[model samples]
Target chain A: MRLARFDGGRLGVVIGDEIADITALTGADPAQWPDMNMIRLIRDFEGLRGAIEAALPGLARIPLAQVSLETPVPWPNKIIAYPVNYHAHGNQGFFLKPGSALSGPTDPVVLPAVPGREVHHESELAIIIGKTCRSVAREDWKDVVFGYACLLDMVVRGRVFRKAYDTFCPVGPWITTADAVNDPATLDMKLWVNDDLRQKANTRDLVLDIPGMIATASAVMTLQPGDIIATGTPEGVGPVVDGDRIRIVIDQVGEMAVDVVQGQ
Target chain B: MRLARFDGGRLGVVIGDEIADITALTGADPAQWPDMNMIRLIRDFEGLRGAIEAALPGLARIPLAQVSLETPVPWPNKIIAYPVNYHAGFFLKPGSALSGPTDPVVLPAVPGREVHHESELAIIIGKTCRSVAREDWKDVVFGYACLLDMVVRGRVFRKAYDTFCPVGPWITTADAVNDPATLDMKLWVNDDLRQKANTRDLVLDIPGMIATASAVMTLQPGDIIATGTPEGVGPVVDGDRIRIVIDQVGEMAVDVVQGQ
Candidate 1:
């Protein structure tokens, strides 16, 4: 099942060309208040699965194109991205992107007005945590994963302020439940700037795969529900400028396109 | 007024030797669930000031020693720390690393690693703002608190451990502080003074720091911006107690213990 948030925080389940409105179950209203309804839903999904399935037939079905789609998980507790999990020459650790950097799939990535700033887009799969976990083992990694989504880790080209700019991290279309994906390791991921393919690789190339990332990160700190772990991007990373369009597609997970614009 | 979060997330105003319960006003309960009452209060404080002052006289008061004092802001969206502002660069610490004033800092068992204490003034953002001007910086500040950026000797990633950042005693409202740039700050490990300096020594004072951070990303209410630590940074062991005091703001002592 595909879980999504759209049109002013309304929670819904994507079902091929349409979305079944399930906002009522989560108590998420139309207001733009920063609420954790998506986090709560991820935490309580097991208990509510039966009720959600039972009421889906009677719920209102809206065409996907009729409304604006928001990032599936809005305001995650933390967005931990690996700095060099797919490469052998860089630092073998992770860095954090502020939750404020998060934007939706359709939201334009506003390039910060910094002189000589070289903004680049790094495409990777985002692992969404379903529960609070600490020091998770390799075998239990799947048990902690709620689902996956496509994430564009946008970064500035310097050591000082590399990745904390607003709209620097755009994650979405929607999340594909873990059970829906046969194997995360085998998925093909690709990215493009306009019509030119900039990045293409499979998760198989990840130096530290899903299980390894979970174990390594969990050892450092507690992974909370709705926390996002962005697997590192592969080679082929290049620069992006104003009026450019970046697109990311991950097999079985989903795809999203974000426009780039200059900050005023 | 001095605001605090104590006894399992209760919001209060610290008076002389006592605290007036104000959790009700912020709508925070005692269940220990992660909530943003403090953030909401900071955002709505202007409109709610009259009501808060009006209700204070009728509120229940508890002695300062009676409750466990948690960090003034339990969970900020981000904890932006200056690596180099008194002369500092920047980094982000997850809010999960935040522990209360008196909570013990658990030194992770990284073999051959030493943990150090860096004391700095913590600036709490008052409103959601982006690209704020340096001149208008004061308008966006909520208050200030004491922060200890616990670091593990080697890599920067080592600073990401749980219980690495301990903050509080309580937040001193910005209005109460006449000049944040000239405040004296100090840190001690047991009996030895490890760090001591005045905010006057800062390379990028409060206004410059705020303007720089907001220019990069939006600063949310309750978001913590830890002004960089001064010179004389040193190390601590498992059984040591770390203390930090900033003039005009507040002081707090946290124990350092070895973690499994």
Candidate 2:
């Protein structure tokens, strides 16, 4: 099942062209403002799943287009992105993107006003953690994954400062649960800026794969629920300027488009 | 007033040899497990100050040694450290890396990697702000604390392992600190002094650090900006105790242990 956080903080399950509100099943205080609802759902999903399915028939179905969708995990504990995992044999490890850098699917990627610096869009797949674990082994990687989504690692080229400004990491549409995706290796991914196809690749091409990433990262730090691990982007990375609309489509997972605007 | 989180998350104000518990004054539910209370207090400190002070005199005082002290802000949204800012650049340490003053700094098993202690003053943001100018930086600061940036020599990732960043004994509110830029800072490994300098030596100073970071990303209440450490940086190994003291802020000591 595909899970989404829409219209403020209501939790929903996406089915075809409609979304069923499952916010009540999660047992969250509806009166409290929405912030970390998706993370809370992901952490308690096992206990809440049965009730969510049972009450679906009586629930209201909202058209997917009627309500605005927010980023699936609004405030992830940390966003770990690998630096050179693709193109084979590359061994640079991971770096973190602050939680403040996150923006939802519908939000614009505001480019920082850094003179002479160009902002590039990196299309990659994102792995969301299901539970807290440390030093996860290769075989147990899948057991710790909650789901996957498309992520655009917007970067400014120099050091970490170049990549870590607000709205630099755009992730979502919604998360496709791990059980539904059979094999991530078979999925095709692509990204476009306006009408130009800027990046295209398959998960099979990843040098360090998902398992390698989890095993290596968890060895040093504890991986918490709702933590994001953005698999490194493939080739065809280029800059996006003001007014450019960036879109990413990952087979079987989901697709999302965000506009770009110059910051003051 | 000096604020502290102790004995499993109880908030208090330190006075002389004792502390007055003010967790109740903050209106936090006593039954809920302790977490993020200090951050909540800092965010609303301006409005809560009068109540906190009025109730302090009537509250029972606990001996400083009666309870265990936890990190002042256990979970900051982010811990932004200047890489080079005493002459500085910048990097972030995850909130998971934070441990209390009395907690041990666990060195990760990275073969030949040696862990070093970086003594610096920590600026705690009191409000949510972005692109704050240097001239207006003080309005956004909540207070100051002592931070030890534990480094495992190699990639920047080495500086991010859990328990690599240890902060506090307590926070000295911004109002109490007369001049943050000129305070003396010192660190010791066991009995030998390892680092010593003044905040005056900081290349980016307090205002400049805040202005520079806020320009790149938003600084949230409880977020930490660790002013860069000074000269005399050195290595610490298993069985060593590292202690840091900043004149006006406070002092905190932590142990160094080898991770499994």
Candidate 3:
């Protein structure tokens, strides 16, 4: 099941190219819910899931043709982009060195400029947390994921001085179900910068690993669901600019396209 | 009137040194009005002022020993700390240059380890919409605040980092009912730091200089406050751990202590 928040409307679950409205399904407008404001909906995901599950067929009854897509998340309560986590990207042609506290940043570490000056794509296997938890274990990481989304970790390499000021993260097109990702690490992480191949790697090369990142970031702050953690991108991060059409494809999960905009 | 968000309490009005509990004045236990969270009270200083004024006489009527202080704003959504934004210390000491964006920081920017390596401090003047604006200036930057039994800026700092990794800014400790700052300019050029302190008087001194910072921070992302830098501990050279703390009074120069 793919989920999306669009046009400032209630959350919608996507099935194929069609979307099912969950507004009436959830019994309240997505925006009005207390949990709505948080980029991640921890306190509210269970209810939201229950409502959606119960209302699916009925929701599917609606026509998705007329619905518009809001940014997958409008100001996620928190947006965290992970860099250089995949080991496969490291094992490949250009190669990636593991990042550490001692290592610091290799480049400008662009956030929104994602897929910028580099490979831009989505981690379709990515999970959206349903709750806020710190020091999440490897097994527990999946437990926290409410559902999955074709999350796009945007990057810009032109080196905007202030881009890493955080909040540069982007997600969606759709939030797919967790069951859809049977093998998270094995998924093929593909990238297209303005419709061109830049870097391609499988999660088999994730360095420092997902479990390690979850542990490290949580040591600093709680990782809230809906809250995003964009696992790092592969090497060969070519330069991308505003208006570049980028896409991320996961063999089983799905693909998502984002129109890059040079923020003013 | 100084406005504060007491710990575990509502947006509070500070009278003298004591804070008037805004929630009690508004008759809320907070549970019933959970939706009536920090956003509502913090935004309406006018209503907070009115409620505090009506409660003042009654506050006075209470026996001198019977009153209790309320907790400051329950974990103001966020808090932010900057590495170093001043140039005088950088000039005075050679270590003040900002590290290249991705470089590893060897020391906190002060001098050899002494006392405690501390960060600078500032306050959030007001709130605005998404983008930080250039012209929201007003006479609203004059409130002096302390976190002793007063208000500590650290709590707000910890909260934001703990709450949201991407965007939680902390500290809205106090907003002056009337401008209390005289906005002064004081600074030292990088070369001035080497010039033996006489030539480059800080163009932006402490005190009301917070107004200068407010112009940039704007305090909107869940209560982001910029604590102004403290006085320098002489000069700053690279690989030094620096700490600064300025008082509510502009007379309190931005003090800086250095570490090697």
Candidate 4:
């Protein structure tokens, strides 16, 4: 199932290039407002899934092109990003990013000018949590995940600038449910600057696979719904300049495009 | 004036050792709850102050000993802690450990672990602003409060933990503070004095802390910038009761207990 929160919090399920209004399918009254965010929907998925499946066929579909996409989860309680999940950076421990740095797929990746500070693009798979849990085991990893999304773990290259800046992370377009993914460990993801491919890696190559990463993070903090974890990027991270168009596509999941602009 | 969020979300005005029933005083019918959170109150302080002053005359008060005080802002949109702005710092602290002022600071450190308390004065952001000028810094401050920069030494290098940051008691409106720079802040573990300092001796002070932080991240309503702790940072363990107080601002107490 592909779910999206767009056009200022309208919940919908996307299929191919069309979207089914979730409220119409769930029999939610139009006269009243419902819990429109993805987290609320996922929290109640145990019952809502059957309603969504039954309401899918006859519901009128809206073309995906007609709506605007926002960060699937806005104002996450926390945005945890890992360090050495991949081999190249010596497998350092995990760190955090301010949720303030998050921007949507359509939002521009804004970089503040810091004289000689170099801004780099890191392409990573983003995991959106469905259930809130703590100290979760590797075997139970599948239980907490809502789905996955395309993400750019944009950061400054050196140890000097704490790994995050304003507008440093861009996520979304939509979330592809965990049930739809057979093996998260085998997804192919790539990053491109303009038309030039910069970095490419498969999830199978991650030093710490999906469950291990989730387990490690939960040991530190309570994993809440809508919390985002940006698994570390591969080796090919390079500099991005103003006016650059950056894009990342993941096999079987989805793709996202972001434009770069000079710091204001 | 001082404001608090207590007994699960009841809003109150703190005066000495008693709390005024803000909801009853303002006639905010519980049948229809108004926006009583700190962020909402801070945003509308200009008008709310006059109303609160007028309502205080006939309002009944409850002793502070009878109520449970929660963190002034329970879930801040963001909790930004400076690593070593006064020294050398980086890394954003997590918001998970922001336990209520009256709640126990469940010391995550079990046996053979070192848990330290760094008491510091915290500044609350009233309005959302980005790239604010240093000269315009005063316009951005919502109020001041006491905070505990709790840390588990050596567990995950310099930083990294869920229960390491505790902030609260209540927020003392900026207008109520006389001179923040000259305020004396001190911390004690039971009866033993562990740390002491005056804000006037701070390397970055208040405006510098706010300006340096705003230059990096956008300051949002209810967001906190805990000015780095002064010297005398030490460790605490199970059964230790930590007390952090700042003159004319606010104070908070948390007991350390072994993590399960």
Predicted structure with the largest DockQ when compared to the true one = 1
Model 2 ranges with Cα > 4 A deviation? A30-34, A88-92, B29-34
lDDT, residue B134, model 2: 85
User: Ten-residue segment with the worst summed lDDT in candidate 2 chain A?
Assistant: A27-36
Chain A TM-score of model 2 comes to 0.95
Quote the positional error of residue A233 for candidate 1 in Å. Answer: 0.8
lDDT by residue for model 2 (B1-260), tens: 89998887888899998999997778754343225678778988999999988888898899998878889887677889996555426888877788898799988867766787899899999988999988898899999999998887756578878888898899899999999988999999999998888888888778888988898888888899988888778898889999899998999999888887
B1-260 in candidate 3: lDDT tens per residue?
Answer: 54433333344444443545556665545552123344444455555656667677675232212343222233223233333344551100000111111122232222333222222333433444332333434423223322110111222112222211111112323443223233222223232421112112334443323343333222332333333333432333343322112233211112222223
Instruction: Evaluate residue B210 in candidate 2 and report its C-alpha lDDT on the 0 to 100 scale.
Output: 90
By DockQ, highest first, what's the ranking? Answer: 1, 2, 4, 3
Model 3 C-alpha lDDT per residue in residues A1-264, reported as the tens digit of each score = 666666564666777667777656555456542224324333465556676677776655445557656545443344444555655424211111100100001112222323324433333235556666765766666666665555544333332122223223344556656676776667776777765887787766777565665665565455555555556667755555656766667666666555544533
Better of 3 and 4 by lDDT: 4
lDDT by residue for model 2 over A33-114, one digit each (tens)?
A: 2266677777777888788889889988999889888788865667899975667322446888888888888899999887
- Candidates sorted by TM-score, descending order? 1, 2, 4, 3
* Residue pairs in collision within model 2: B84-B88, B85-B88
Please provide, for model 1 over B1-260, each residue's C-alpha lDDT reduced to its tens digit, 9 standing for 90 to 100.
89988877788999889999988775766573456668878888888878878899999999998889988876688889887656535789888788898799998887877888889899999999998998899899999999998898865468888888898999999998999998989898998988888898888888988998898889899999998887788888889999899999999999888886
Docking class of 3: incorrect
Model 4 residue runs over 4 Å out of place are: A23-36, A57-60, A87-92, A159-162, B23-36, B56-60, B84-88, B109-112, B155-158
Model 4 docking tier (incorrect/acceptable/medium/high): acceptable
After superposing candidate 3 on the true structure, give the runs of residues whose Cα lies further than 4 Å from its correct spot. Answer: A24-41, A60-65, A72-77, A88-127, A155-161, A165-167, A251-254, A261-264, B5-9, B24-36, B43-80, B87-119, B129-221, B228-246, B249-260
Kindly indicate the candidate among 2 and 3 with the higher DockQ.
2
Q: What is the overall TM-score of model 1 with all chains considered together?
A: 0.96
TM-score to native of every candidate shown? 0.96, 0.95, 0.63, 0.91
- Candidate 3 accuracy as TM-score: 0.63
